[PDB]
Structures are given as C-alpha cells and as structure tokens.
Structure 1
Amino acid sequence: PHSHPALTPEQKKELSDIAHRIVAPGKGILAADESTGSIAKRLQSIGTENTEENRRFYRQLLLTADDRVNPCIGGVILFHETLYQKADDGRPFPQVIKSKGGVVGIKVDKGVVPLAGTNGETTTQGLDGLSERCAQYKKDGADFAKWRCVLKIGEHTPSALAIMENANVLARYASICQQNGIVPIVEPEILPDGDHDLKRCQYVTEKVLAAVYKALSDHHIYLEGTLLKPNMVTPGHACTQKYSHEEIAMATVTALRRTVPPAVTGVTFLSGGQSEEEASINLNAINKCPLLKPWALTFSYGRALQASALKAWGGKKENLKAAQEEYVKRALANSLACQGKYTPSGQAGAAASESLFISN
C-alpha cells in the first residue's frame, strides 16, 4: 500500500521517449534476433552453411538497405553476436542502425525450458545476471530489449501454471530492463499451432494478456516505458473454418482493447508464420478496424520481413542488391500497413504468398 518509486521522473522520461521513437507513426521493428541455432535453420533453407561470416553478411545485407527503409524502421532487434559485429566499412552494426534513424534493441532471453508436470508447456529463462548484461548492452548502443515466452493452445493448454509463470518471468525481465534504461518489449506469444478457431484464440489471448498486465502491475512496471509484442488473433494453422482479414482484425483489436491499458506505448505484432503478404494485409486491416485503439499498432516482424530477402540472396554476394530490394519492399508495405494505407498489388513475388509457419 506504500509506494517505493522504482523509477525517477528522469528515468521514466528516457524509457517513454525511447518507446515512442520505436513505434513512431509509420514505423515498425525489424526482428533480426535469430539465435545461432535459429538462423542456422534459415541459412540451411538456402544451401548456406551457418558461419559467423555468413551470418554477419546476412545481417549487414538487411541493416545496410537503402534510405527508403529509414522511415519504415523505428527499431531493429539483434542477437548478442550481431550487436558486436561490424559492417564492411568498419562501422559497428549498432552505429549503422542509429545512423539510419533506428533504435537498437537486444534479445536477452536464453530460450524456453520445459515446465515439469505440464503437457509439453514451457517458461523462459535468462534472468541470471540480466542486470549487468543490460547495463553493458546500454553502454554499447542498445535502448530496448526483447524476451520471448511461448504458450500453446491445446486441450489442456495453456494451463493456469504456464500462464502465471510466463507472466511472472516477463514481469521480472521488464523490471530489470527498466532499471537499466532499457525499454522491455514484452512478448507472450501464443503459437498458431493447432486446429482451434478464431474465437478460441481470442479467448486465450485475452486471458493471457490479462495475466501479463496483472503481473506487470504487481512488479511495478512502468507501462509507458514498454511495448507489447503479441500474436495477432487468428484461427489455428490447421483450422478448417475460413475467416476474412476484417474478422482477424476485429478479434485482434477486441482482445487488445479488453486487456491492454492505454498507457502501453505500442503493440508490435509478431508475424508468427504468416506469409509476408498475409502479415502486411492483417496489420493493415487491424489499423483500419473501426474501434478505438489507444496504442500504436505496428510490426515487429522477423520472418515476414526476411522471407523474400533470404530467397533472393541465396547466400551469394552477387545477389546483394536483389536481396535488399525485397526487404525494402516489405518494409515499405508494412510501413503503410501500420498506417492502414496499404493496398496489395501483384508483385512481392510468390515467396511473399507462401506461409512461413514452423510447427513447434
């Protein structure tokens, strides 16, 4: 019942300013924080061996795209390794990102671990020494961070324990981040895996977000200095019933309106397996949804911004420009999408029409 300010007015301002810059109108996030074992899968789908150099080059390819992306990208999430890598001109990637008007973000979780006594459910680790790590990341150019929790819709999941534990650890992570001037992106991802319908996903998403914000309140989290990275509300990947983009948008926005306090600076949707075009079209429909939305509704896409780029690159240096062109096109599309001004056309290749879903 007695307040013990976790943050000073000066600290709140820094976090709030940072969070707003990331989701400034028309801007979104490029999520290039794939771990070594994660990006390896991507490079593997293009006959490119996973080496530090190939990874460096690939990240450079995306980070050094032409100035057309500048207005589209408010922030870029990187993996530890990439944060300390340099472009061919000797500039550290964080400097490259900043020079283009982007805020630098660092993924800080250490992956999921199984929750004993549950039906294949997990929580996420990475709190140990997080404070020292954040202080260091801050000094090295990072202003925000990301932590991913993963939940799954099934007959007995997500369980009460899974929801509570994941919500609690997100709160702990967000608390430590804010103590070090880093804006925490809270990511409670509910996988699209399964044959559940739209209303099932909406129901679960509402329960999960309600739990997340109660935990954030219990841990004294400054909402204005945070961002939310949730799954859009969609039917399961194996669901038979078909839904329109307007319906997905309505379910997504309704779920958010029922759980996310207006103080939250912005919502940066994960693409979660959706095709590049599907992700853009849904985000656009979301921003057009005829309901009051007190927070920025933009993107924090990983796969939905890299599909075509990876394919065009093929691991060959000569395809540099071609790869960057595809990326730029998705960044431009999504920039318009988070403004509800996106209108599909007929290009972006067929690679943008293919589902990037990956069962877990």
Structure 2
Amino acid sequence: PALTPEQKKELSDIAHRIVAPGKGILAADESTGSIAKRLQSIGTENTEENRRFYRQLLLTADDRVNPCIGGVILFHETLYQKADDGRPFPQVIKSKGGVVGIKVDKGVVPLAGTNGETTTQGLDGLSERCAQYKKDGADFAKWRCVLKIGEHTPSALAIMENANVLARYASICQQNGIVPIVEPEILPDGDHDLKRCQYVTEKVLAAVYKALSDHHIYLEGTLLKPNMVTPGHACTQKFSHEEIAMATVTALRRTVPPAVTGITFLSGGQSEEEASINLNAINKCPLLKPWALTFSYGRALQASALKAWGGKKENLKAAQEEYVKRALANSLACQGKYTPAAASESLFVSN
C-alpha cells in the first residue's frame, strides 16, 4: 500500500480545503526568469527586493480576499522571504485562511526525436525537497507539463512521457504528506479550432489518469490543473462562452474520475475578464460535475495589479485593490454568480 488511512485522510483534508466552496488558488510562482519579463513590462528592475515587494503586495491584500483564496502557490525563493512586518510569507498566507503551496518542477526539457516537444524535469531529490517544504509550511505542490497542438503533436511519446513524470512526481509528493496539483497544460498556440482542442484534451487526460492509476496515486488527495478547452489563439473562427463551457465540461466528464477532489483551471493567456467569464459559464453548465471546478490563476489575477503598481510604492493600495477585484470576481465565478481595459488585454505569450 502506498499510504495508510491516516495519511490518506490528511491529503483528502488538505485538498478539500484549497477548493472549498467559492475558493480558488493564486498562482504566484513565477521563476526568477519568468517574473523578469512581467517586471520588465512595467519598467521595474528584477531585484530580490522588488520581487519580495511585489509578492508582499499580493499576499498582504485586505481581508476581503480571505474567503476567495484557498491556497497560494509560491516559488522557492518566496517561500523563504518575509513581509515588512517580519512575518515569513507562509504564515502571512495561513493567517488569512489559505494553504501554502510550492512549485517543485525544474522546467521543461526537449524530447529528442520529436517536432519540438518537451518533457519536464525535477524528480532528482524531490522526496527530500518535499519533506523539507512540508516542514517549512507548504502543504501542496505544483508540477507543470507542456504539450502543444501542431500537425504531429502532441506525440504518442510525448503524451506518455509527460503522463509518467506527472505520476512519479505525485507519488513522491503524497509519500511526504504533500498534495500534488497535476498540471497537464495544452498550450493555446496555433490555429486549431475548438473540437480539436477537445479531442486533444480528452486524449491527454485519459493518459494522465491511466498513468496515475498505474503508479498507485490516491486521487482524493490530488488536484487537476488543466487548460480550459478553447479554440487556438490564431483561430479565425469564433466561439461563445457557452460553447467553450460545454466543451470543457464535456471533456472533463469523459476522462476525470469523480474521485478527484478539485479541478483548478489555468488561464492560459486569456484576459483577466474572459478567464472569469468562462469559469462562470463552466459552473453554470447544467451537466453533472462531481468535482470542484475553480481557478488556479497566475496572469489572470495579477495583470491589473501589476500595471497599477508600476513599480511605485505609492501605488500599493491601488494595485492591491485591483487584485482583490479579480479575486472576488473569480470567487463568484466558480459558483456561477458572476455577472458583471487592463482586465480585457489578451495575456497570450508564445510558449
């Protein structure tokens, strides 16, 4: 047996907290190189104190966020940083009613023989890392795999390998009391339409859950972090929020066992507002959906806050109020009760 009954209950508990009703996740875990591009976009230098101040900005927003945010995914460096008032960032997060999460993958690597496809690395020593992260206050984890729709992608070799590394990663995580968020991202890059994303999404989740079965993963103690199902970014043809919602809820109904505790969508380049509108179309779909359907958003919670901060410490409480509007909009959207410029900008970046 991979896990005892006591360990199993710890993971089911943690997982049910994160996606408790009306709650989602703040995906604040950009690498140093990734937060560089977002900082550069607003003229701000990429320094440890600027990254600490921006992350402090988001975690210390006012208590209206506390029922909207069940967990916060951090990057290594940030997990060991402190707020201005001396408190370490994980206590800041718990103090407001959220679970601390840590991103543990070490990025993507090319898979030879293929048309530009990648797998993901980071399992070397992961068991010790997780033990220490759990000791230092993290209770869930994140791993991101990346597949792309092209004419000979996602490859069979690609789907199989990424599904297998996901499951390893998750086996290790649960051995150490850490709930794994399983992230199989199909990028929106390309001109494919909606049905094609739906075919490819179904195909990839089927392989993911098979691989999870094979490796003995306790599914009640996992979260699934999939793309919404949407046309490609360069698709000429257009589709409604209902067509997207149907197509996403259909693909997940056909592949994800009800035992999975929560589905926390990535935004994938969607504008802040479209991400919220779609998330709401999905939770208003009449079809039966046996799991939480909520948000795990990075860019679609932070773009308005970033441009309202501008790097200027005076703008803190305008930036913080921009985050809290998107945090509140999504908490309503994952219950179907959201019906409403920098929030309308496409956030799509190639790869």
CA deviation after TM superposition for structure 1 residue 119, in Å: 0.2
Question: 2:321 and 2:22 mapped to 1: Cα distance?
Answer: 19
SS of structure 2 residue aligned to 1:77: strand
CA-to-aligned-CA distance 1:90-115 (integer Å, 9 cap, x gap):
00000000000000000000000000
Give the counterpart of 2:348 among 334, 345, 357: 357
Flag as ranges the 4+ runs of structure 1 deviating above 6 A: none
Question: 1:49 and 1:123 mapped to 2: Cα distance?
Answer: 31
Question: 1:253 and 1:222 mapped to 2: Cα distance?
Answer: 23
Question: 1:120 and 1:44 mapped to 2: Cα distance?
Answer: 28
Question: 2:80 and 2:142 mapped to 1: Cα distance?
Answer: 17
Instruction: Map 1:77-92 to 2 at 5 A.
Output: 77-92=73-88
CA-to-aligned-CA distance 1:191-243 (integer Å, 9 cap, x gap):
00000000000000000000000000000000000000000000000001100
Question: 1:44 and 1:228 mapped to 2: Cα distance?
Answer: 31
CA deviation after TM superposition for structure 1 residue 290, in Å: 1.3
Between the two proteins, the alignment pairs up a number of residues equal to 351
**Equivalent position of 2:3 in the other structure:** 7
CA deviation after TM superposition for structure 1 residue 46, in Å: 0.2
Question: 1:355 and 1:235 mapped to 2: Cα distance?
Answer: 14
Q: TM-score, normalised by structure 2?
A: 1.00
Instruction: Map 1:211-230 to 2 at 5 A.
Output: 211-230=207-226
Question: 1:40 and 1:242 mapped to 2: Cα distance?
Answer: 33
**Equivalent position of 1:315 in the other structure:** 311
CA-to-aligned-CA distance 1:251-287 (integer Å, 9 cap, x gap):
0000000000000000000000000000000000000
**Equivalent position of 1:58 in the other structure:** 54
Question: 2:310 and 2:215 mapped to 1: Cα distance?
Answer: 45
Question: 1:41 and 1:262 mapped to 2: Cα distance?
Answer: 38
SS of structure 2 residue aligned to 1:98: helix
**Equivalent position of 1:104 in the other structure:** 100
Question: 1:290 and 1:86 mapped to 2: Cα distance?
Answer: 44
Question: 1:270 and 1:340 mapped to 2: Cα distance?
Answer: 18
SS of structure 1 residue aligned to 2:8: helix
CA deviation after TM superposition for structure 1 residue 293, in Å: 0.3
Question: 1:202 and 1:64 mapped to 2: Cα distance?
Answer: 38
Question: 2:145 and 2:40 mapped to 1: Cα distance?
Answer: 25
Question: 1:340 and 1:197 mapped to 2: Cα distance?
Answer: 26
Give the unaligned 5+ runs of structure 2: none
CA-to-aligned-CA distance 1:13-33 (integer Å, 9 cap, x gap):
000000000000000000000
**Equivalent position of 1:333 in the other structure:** 329
CA-to-aligned-CA distance 1:172-203 (integer Å, 9 cap, x gap):
00000000000000000000000000000000
Question: 1:245 and 1:120 mapped to 2: Cα distance?
Answer: 31
SS of structure 2 residue aligned to 1:142: coil
Question: 1:202 and 1:80 mapped to 2: Cα distance?
Answer: 34
CA-to-aligned-CA distance 1:48-94 (integer Å, 9 cap, x gap):
01000000000000000000000000000000000000000000000
CA-to-aligned-CA distance 1:304-347 (integer Å, 9 cap, x gap):
00000000000110000000000000000000000010012xxx
**Equivalent position of 1:49 in the other structure:** 45
**Equivalent position of 1:161 in the other structure:** 157
Percent of aligned positions with the same letter in both sequences?
99
RMSD: 0.3
Matched, 1:205 2:164: no
Instruction: Map 1:144-159 to 2 at 5 A.
Output: 144-159=140-155
Give the unaligned 5+ runs of structure 1: 345-349
SS of structure 2 residue aligned to 1:184: strand
SS of structure 1 residue aligned to 2:139: strand
Question: 2:306 and 2:143 mapped to 1: Cα distance?
Answer: 24
Question: 1:357 and 1:68 mapped to 2: Cα distance?
Answer: 29
SS of structure 1 residue aligned to 2:154: coil
Question: 2:215 and 2:101 mapped to 1: Cα distance?
Answer: 22
